[PDB]
Write a protein that binds this DNA or RNA. Structure first.
Lengths: 454, 96, 88, 105, 94, 96, 79, 104, 92
DNA sequence: TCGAGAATCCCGGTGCCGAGGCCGCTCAATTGGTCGTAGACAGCTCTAGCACCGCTTAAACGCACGTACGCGCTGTCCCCCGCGTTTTAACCGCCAAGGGGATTACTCCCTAGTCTCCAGGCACGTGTCAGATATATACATCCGAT
DNA sequence: ATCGGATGTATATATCTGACACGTGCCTGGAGACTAGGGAGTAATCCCCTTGGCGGTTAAAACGCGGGGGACAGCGCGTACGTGCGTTTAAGCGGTGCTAGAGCTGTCTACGACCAATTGAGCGGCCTCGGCACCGGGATTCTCGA
């Protein structure tokens, strides 16, 4: 079946024609195999050919639930409307006084096929979605369910179905528990083999190539992971360098005197080994003045900022646009008073940036000859999926605490249509907590690169 | 343009807040009022989350025990309004 | 100007104007004045200065750093305001 | 034959006579002394639960929840003086509108 | 582990003797847990301050019969004396 | 025909009865008030004569402790006269 | 009978120590009604101690022991 | 070599160590627990007398009579809270007249 | 016959005052004051040592029970008057 | 003085998680038997309490008065209620760390038991002077007056 | 503003009396030297909270508002409490009998403390299935108006 059926017009692409006949194999024997891919390869179009393909061929045409994030909820009602207009869609939104029209007169009358929903709408329709024998329930961006003490693990196992499908973009943490915890949801005949092949996974295998690379023939009908450089064969740059630097006397003495104070000031790594290590005077106890007038020797103090104290005379003239990811928006109020005070045209985003305020800045940040080059991101909201493709240089600050995040935060560089050279820096000092953290990021990444290798 | 007289909804809160025993004052800001005041007495304290409720179940039974004895001095002055002339009389006889 | 957490609010204002009405509505008062909402926010802070001080003193005594509800009830017992409903 | 069902009680006696001596309340505890205590312990717990059995049938419910005890103690007069400075967790309060805050007619 | 020895059954036996078709919620178990103690640790610490006056040591069934007429205000002292002594003369004579 | 105004000798008893600590209420009739009330509780009682004083030194420190807290509710009503509208408020907040 | 014991002036010279200025007339039936109450929560706990110690003589330590209980501790007689 | 005088105090420790064993406070009392209690009681007993002693001459007498102890607990911001339930035989009260009963 | 404190308080007076005599009944108050403070510290000391399921009154179970009872800037004084005596009763 | 009209009550449905039953368990109550002793009942002493009776004068009572405050009624401002309107701040869920609170289980040491002195504290003998009555000294103080 | 009382404080011999003191046994503290039971002090294993970021929902909180009913000074007014003076009237003290009972003395049992066997009553788990919480929906009624 290596064409598309005539309710899906428009010539679904060749890397997804091979994503359907290979997906027929998952329909047959019941395995709800995970389908992961790189961002932008149209995982939507591999799912509308799973809720309309059943109609003429398999003959079901029943209730189907799809759980997607709310930031992509605007996309899905359009994509069924693009390709297959015959279908029923039913999106969910509103307060009490405007939602229940879509629960009194649309759902319980069975007047729906595709019930596109939000994650918060599952927990407040946990009665009104139980009333259906669901057929194929697909959750996209499938990494919320890594925690089994959730209230989505212990909710979406309640109402049942024949088979399913999951879509993520990521195989998870190399402490291995988050692989099985989704597999305890893929098939309920896997938890009887998860901790029963438990000697067959835990040992750090010297024979990867003779156990782990031959473990896949059992597990290859469970997963997929693909790469954009085999669909364009032109996306050249992938570059990542970093330095090894050191602080100064206001947070070197206090690097090694607050341990006298401790061995508040509790949770020493967050409280006293990220604040007093990355960017300085986050307690207002390392102040020169109650006038606090912004000046040098208040950006000379940091080990990190003293690179930026010399970077943004180099970085301005090379021609880039600098995307700075960071943690901890309290710290961005220091970085925003590095470019207001020193005349660098800036923009910003955080978790408090409401959604129309977000895109109203991004569009002017994507004017072709614009002014404001520096855009303050944050790694936790810098993984949604948002159009930032007009920059070419990214400087993370800290350690990627969960190591896919800043490897997902590089997807604000190599999204579709980026023929520029991409340079991505990183800051890690010496003797700090963060090399062990970046050792912990070294170990959590040389074993799922393995999965891409194997 | 319907509207009750002033002196009406003030009764339909009394006969509703004297039946339901929900926690009145807000449970998350009352948590971080207790954690602040203890830091004048000893830094670096942790509370049991079923112990910060024990202040919320007891401080309300002190203020309601104050406002059920404040109003008896307000009505004694033959007005129907409490004032800090009444609170500073109510705490005088018991607990100054 | 933007670096600081400075120009924001306190935590003694954490109990607000309607949460002192709906306390007083339980108390059986009809019309609160407008002056009260600073007087009551004071006398609540004094009473928590005479319970937590008798609560940390028990907690330092066992050399714990965990103010349990047993310690809070045993503080309220001595000053004649015995609380039930937390074991003991 | 126990001791806690030798005088026809329903509280324990052997648990109480343990606690009158490890609680350091005296040096010598009489043998027939905690048996006299384990009736006044129960008559004060068969008085509150008698009046709590006139709140569940006064609010059309079956269980006893701590709003019932607050209505049980305060409408009484004799258990109110014993428990004068005594609170109850989530007990609320007795409903009482003072007789001048009424409307005009 | 951690037996901790409440009065969770004995109160519930008293409920099956005065309203034998009701029940008590497990939150109100913890209140009546801490209402028999507040009679226990108020009578037992009363006879301790009463045997110490006369300078004896033996808490008898008369340093409790005196220590009940002080706490129980009116019409509970005139029963719990005659209810307690019912469960003493029925004790020793069997 | 000299006479002070009303409002004068009522002050020259206050500043004299707040200095001398003589026993105010009469010691022989207060003796036979105590001996009567005990006879409802047990007949045929004898008192130590330094124990009937122990009621007289303690009941006066209850009434003076009542009238120093009665007047704060009288002045709160913006008159300068006590009434049983005030005593029944003063005993309400502490000891009804 | 004997409630003529504490007189009208013997309440006046109490109320001067309390710091009031003009006594009404309705008080003289209320004050005897609140002095007769306080001698029925002390004497009732003085007879109980004296009957307990098997004595027929109410002593100066019983009344201080009774007043110790309800938070009106009296010094100057013993303890 | 006596026990109080080795502790540098005035109150007895040979008597307090007997009044902790025989009052059924606990079974075992510490070695130093009737020294540290014979000192906490020293300071408070010295505090009442000296603060009675400065006001032992407002009436220019030289015997403390029970009016003066009453003007030594009720004339203090902190010792009054320790004894705001108590009375004293023949203590009296302070001279005060409220601010509306006065002549004006 | 009895026993009381009418010889020790007369010494503590004759430190802080050389000349002010003290009368009979005013010794009876100070007699019945340091029997109140003794039976308010220890009764709080005992119940504190029983909350923790121990058996021993010590100077760590008094010092906590003096910080509760003493209102404010008296426990700041009286701790400095007690621990001055332990460092002599032990160090001699 | 009775119709519009919302608030509140009272029915019926659903469905969910706490409360009660029931099992296995283990260890604190329960007997029987020693052995010491505090309190029980008898027995004597003296002490403090009750009831008298007679005398002397502070102190209460019932008498006028007469002004001064308590209550009633007024207009008179003005301060908080009741309801529609913006945005915010609680309230869930989640994330990724690591650590401070509780049985085992071991083996010092500081508190109590016993026997034997002894010096410190305690009532009771004389035996003194610091308050307190007093009574005559001058001496600082709010109303009938202008 | 000034002159007649009515309140108060400086004072001297001049006494009673209680606080400060001296001389005696006896009773408890303390020195002593063992002896054990409490708890210090580590040492594994597990479970709840804290730091500062992201996501969304959604009833409350916050801000306007006109409006209306209460607060609050005035002012009349009228009994009702204060003040003071001749008249009774019971407290107070002062002896003086007269004996009940508080506190003790002195035996000697009746009764708890404690022991090791004893062996069920009461303890945390587990599964379950009525009580009650909730959401529609329509009856009942409670306060605004004519």
């Amino acid at each position: 079946f290596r064409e598309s059926p005539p309710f899906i017009k428009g010539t679904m692409r060749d890397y997804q024609i091979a994503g359907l006949n290979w997906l027929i194999s998952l329909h047959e024997n019941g395995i709800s195999g995970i389908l992961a891919d790189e961002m932008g390869l149209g995982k939507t179009l591999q799912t509308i050919s799973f809720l309309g393909y059943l109609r003429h061929i398999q003959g079901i045409t029943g209730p189907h639930l799809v759980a997607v994030p709310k930031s992509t909820l605007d996309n899905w009602k359009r994509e069924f409307e693009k390709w297959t207009p015959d279908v029923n869609v039913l999106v969910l939104q509103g307060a009490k006084e405007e939602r229940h029209q879509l629960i009194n007169d649309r759902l319980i009358d069975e007047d729906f096929d595709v019930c596109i929903t939000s994650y918060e709408m599952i927990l407040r329709e946990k009665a009104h979605l139980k009333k259906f024998a669901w057929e194929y329930i697909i959750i996209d961006e499938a990494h919320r369910i890594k925690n089994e003490e959730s209230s989505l693990s212990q909710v979406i196992r309640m109402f049942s179905s024949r088979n399913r499908l999951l879509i993520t973009g990521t195989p998870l943490q190399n402490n291995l528990h988050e692989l099985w915890a989704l597999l305890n949801f893929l098939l309920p005949d896997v938890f009887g083999d998860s901790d029963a092949f438990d000697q067959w996974f835990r040992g750090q295998d010297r024979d990867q190539d003779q156990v782990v690379q031959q473990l896949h023939r059992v597990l290859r009908p469970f997963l997929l992971r693909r790469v954009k450089s085999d669909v364009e064969k032109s996306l050249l740059p992938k570059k990542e360098i970093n330095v090894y630097i050191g602080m100064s006397e206001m947070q070197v003495k206090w690097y090694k005197k607050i341990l006298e104070k401790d061995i508040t000031r509790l949770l020493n790594i967050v409280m006293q080994l990220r604040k007093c290590c990355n960017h300085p005077y986050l307690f207002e106890g390392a102040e020169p003045g109650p006038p606090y007038t912004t000046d040098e020797h208040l950006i000379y103090n940091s080990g990190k900022m003293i690179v930026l104290d010399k970077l943004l005379k180099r970085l301005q003239s090379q021609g880039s646009r600098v995307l700075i990811f960071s943690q901890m928006s309290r710290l961005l109020d220091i970085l925003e008073d590095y470019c207001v005070f020193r005349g660098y045209k800036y923009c910003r985003i955080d978790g408090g940036t409401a959604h129309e305020d977000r895109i109203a800045a991004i569009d002017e940040y994507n004017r072709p000859g614009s002014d404001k080059f520096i855009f303050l991101l944050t790694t936790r909201a810098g993984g949604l999926g948002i159009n930032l493709t007009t920059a070419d240089t990214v400087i993370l600050y800290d350690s990627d605490w969960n190591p896919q995040a800043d490897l997902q935060a590089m997807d604000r560089a190599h999204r579709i249509g980026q023929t520029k050279q991409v340079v991505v820096y990183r800051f890690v000092t010496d003797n700090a907590i963060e090399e062990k953290v970046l050792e912990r990021a070294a170990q959590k990444l040389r074993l799922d690169q393995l999965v891409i290798q194997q | 343009p319907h509207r009750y007289r002033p002196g009406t909804v003030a009764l339909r809160e009394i006969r509703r807040y004297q039946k339901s025993t929900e926690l009145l004052i807000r449970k998350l800001p009352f948590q971080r009022l207790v954690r602040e005041i203890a830091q004048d007495f000893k830094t670096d304290l942790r509370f049991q989350s079923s112990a910060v409720m024990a202040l919320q179940e007891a401080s309300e039974a002190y203020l309601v025990g104050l406002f059920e004895d404040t109003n008896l001095c307000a009505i004694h002055a033959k007005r129907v309004t409490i004032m800090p002339k009444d609170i500073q009389l109510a705490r005088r006889i018991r607990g100054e | 100007a933007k670096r600081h957490r400075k120009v924001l609010r306190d935590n003694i204002q954490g109990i607000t104007k309607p949460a002192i009405r709906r306390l007083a509505r339980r108390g059986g008062v009809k019309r609160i004045s407008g002056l009260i909402y600073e007087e009551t926010r004071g006398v609540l802070k004094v009473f928590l200065e005479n319970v937590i001080r008798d609560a940390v003193t028990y907690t330092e005594h066992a050399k714990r750093k965990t103010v349990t509800a047993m310690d809070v009830v045993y503080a309220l017992k001595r000053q004649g305001r015995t609380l039930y409903g937390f074991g003991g | 034959k126990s001791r806690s069902n030798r005088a026809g009680l329903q509280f324990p006696v052997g648990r109480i006579h343990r606690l009158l001596r490890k609680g350091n309340y005296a040096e010598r505890v009489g043998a027939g002394a905690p048996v006299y205590l384990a009736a006044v312990m129960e008559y004060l717990a068969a008085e509150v639960l008698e009046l709590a059995g006139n709140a569940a049938r006064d609010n059309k419910k079956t269980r006893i929840i701590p709003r019932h005890l607050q209505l049980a103690i305060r409408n009484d007069e004799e258990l109110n003086k014993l428990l004068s400075g005594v609170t109850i967790a989530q007990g609320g309060v007795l409903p009482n509108i003072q007789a001048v805050l009424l409307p005009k007619k | 582990r951690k037996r901790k020895e409440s009065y969770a059954i004995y109160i519930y036996k008293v409920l099956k003797q005065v309203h034998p078709d009701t029940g008590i919620s497990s939150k109100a178990m913890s209140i009546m847990n801490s209402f028999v103690n507040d009679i226990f640790e108020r009578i037992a610490a009363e006879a301790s301050r009463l045997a110490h006056y006369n300078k004896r040591s033996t808490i008898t069934s008369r340093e409790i019969q005196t220590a009940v007429r002080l706490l129980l205000p009116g019409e509970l002292a005139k029963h719990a004396v005659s209810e307690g002594t019912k469960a003493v003369t029925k004790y020793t004579s069997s």
